[PDB]
């Protein structure tokens, strides 16, 4: 007899869930101690394994996408983990990031790229990291932290196939 | 892939403690049925739900769909499952209005801001208002009742008023 569902395990990609093509990544599922069976799966495919750990020595376009895991106790399945979004990076030439300070506390940044991409992603280093997504290459940021910013471009047709990261831009507020 | 129907039987207005059965119905032979309640987002992989005794907590919006092969149907129309008798019944009156118009008053103690009036028959005629005053244009003689509820919880209704037996000239 049992009070409720088994708590979900965590699912983590080391060293990062942004993985340049041909670089290694390790997906690790972690539940409480004493798990009988771990199941790790890739969503929208028939792909899954009965093991906690997936080691991808060289990242590929085909391994990019949504993953989750769960575990079994007896024949009972746990709640599933939060979804890990595995991004293949370096699929396209890097964009060039520029930034135009605004007149009152805002900064407009620009992820320039020679293609028709429709999605762009801007971030600042050092956890907590701060992300920003836009359907347009111009991105306005309010009350921006000083820090090191980079951007990525990609198409919503394959939103896990990302460009190489732009060269860093160093924002300093005063 | 065509939507199923979802019915409440005997009715989607269900006095507290009275039974109702929700039934999802698509084509025959299908693999699986999925019935959901929306607010609580709890659900079942079966076509039929029997509620032996209606509760405040079961009232709300429901819908269903079915899966054949690995493919999902369009979802049923939404079923509005209402619990009645959650409050004292209101009291219904009627007066003349202009031309063939009849004005009904659904009177009630509590501050209720919604009212629903109907004429028994096949089909039933339904009327709504936020004020406890309801015009019926070109009204027909018949058996009328009303219900009062709050837009704060639009699925918990009063008991129905005692029937008003209307005769129009």
């Amino acid at each position: 007899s049992q009070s409720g569902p088994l708590p979900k395990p965590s699912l983590q990609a080391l060293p990062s869930s942004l993985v340049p093509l041909e670089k290694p990544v390790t997906l690790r599922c972690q539940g409480p101690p004493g798990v009988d069976l771990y199941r790790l799966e890739k969503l929208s495919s028939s792909r899954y394994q009965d093991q906690a750990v997936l080691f991808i020595p060289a990242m590929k376009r085909s391994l990019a996408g949504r993953y989750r895991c769960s575990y079994q106790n007896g024949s009972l399945w746990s709640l599933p983990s939060d979804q890990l979004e595995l991004v293949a990076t370096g699929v396209f030439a890097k964009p060039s990031l520029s930034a135009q300070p605004g007149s009152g506390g805002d900064v407009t940044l620009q992820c320039q790229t020679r293609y028709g991409f429709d999605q762009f992603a801007l971030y600042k280093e050092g956890d907590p990291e701060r992300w920003y997504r836009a359907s347009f290459p111009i991105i306005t940021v309010t009350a921006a932290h000083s820090g090191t910013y980079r951007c990525y471009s990609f198409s919503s047709r394959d939103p896990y196939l990302w460009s190489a990261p732009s060269d860093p831009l160093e924002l300093v507020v005063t | 892939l065509p939507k199923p129907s979802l019915q409440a039987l005997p009715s989607s207005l269900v006095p507290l403690e009275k039974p109702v059965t929700l039934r999802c119905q698509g084509p025959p032979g299908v693999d699986l049925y999925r019935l959901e309640k929306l607010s609580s987002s709890r659900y079942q992989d079966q076509a039929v739900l029997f509620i032996p005794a209606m509760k405040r907590s079961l009232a709300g919006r429901y819908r269903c769909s079915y899966q054949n092969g690995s493919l999902w149907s369009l979802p049923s129309d939404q079923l509005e499952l209402v619990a009645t008798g959650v409050f004292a019944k209101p009291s219904l009156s009627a007066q003349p209005g202009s031309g063939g118009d009849v004005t009904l008053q659904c009177q009630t103690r509590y501050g209720f801001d919604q009212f629903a009036l109907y004429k028994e028959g096949d089909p039933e005629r339904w009327y709504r208002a936020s004020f406890p005053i309801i015009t019926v244009t070109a009204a027909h003689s018949g058996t009328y009742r009303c219900y009062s509820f709050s837009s704060r919880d639009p699925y918990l209704w009063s008991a129905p008023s005692d029937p008003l037996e209307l005769v129009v000239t």
Partner: peptide
């Protein structure tokens, strides 16, 4: 034997 595959996705959400 080993456990079966993951079930399929649930249906699309409501409006």
């Amino acid at each position: 034997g080993p456990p079966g595959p993951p079930g399929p996705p649930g249906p699309p959400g409501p409006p």
